[PDB]
Design a protein around this ligand. Structure first.
Ligand SMILES: O=c1[nH]c(=S)[nH]c2[nH]c(=S)[nH]c12
Length: 112
């Protein structure tokens, strides 16, 4: 397939995923200055802003590498936060609502 339409599709998909994060709590890296223990067991932080930087740096050339970093946004949050927190429930909801978005986007990609 051709590169430019694939990237235009990942851009749209990333926008749709960000739309599901209505609190915008995954829009930027977790502020280590406010969460000084975050990197103790989170070995690769991830967020939507960095996903955008990776997209435009041509770091996502297939749907799996894009989806892998989205999954990190979710899994890091589930790992760090207790189950009874807003953070944890937000990651569960993002996993649920993001899953449909990714499935449809991958179908569009496989037609290419
Ligand atoms: O998962 C989190 N993501 C962010 S951006 N900030 C923050 N603070 C605590 S505590 N947990 C989290």
């Amino acid at each position: 397939m051709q590169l430019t339409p694939f990237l235009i599709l990942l851009r749209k998909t990333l926008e749709q995923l960000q739309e599901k994060d209505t609190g915008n709590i995954f829009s930027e890296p977790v502020p280590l200055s406010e969460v000084p223990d975050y990197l103790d067991h989170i070995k690769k932080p991830m967020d939507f802003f960095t996903m955008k930087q990776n997209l435009e740096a041509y770091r996502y050339l297939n749907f799996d590498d894009f989806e892998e970093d989205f999954n990190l946004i979710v899994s890091n949050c589930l790992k760090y936060n207790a189950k009874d927190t807003i953070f944890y429930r937000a990651a569960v909801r993002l996993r649920e609502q993001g899953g449909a978005v990714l499935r449809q986007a991958r179908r569009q990609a496989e037609k290419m």
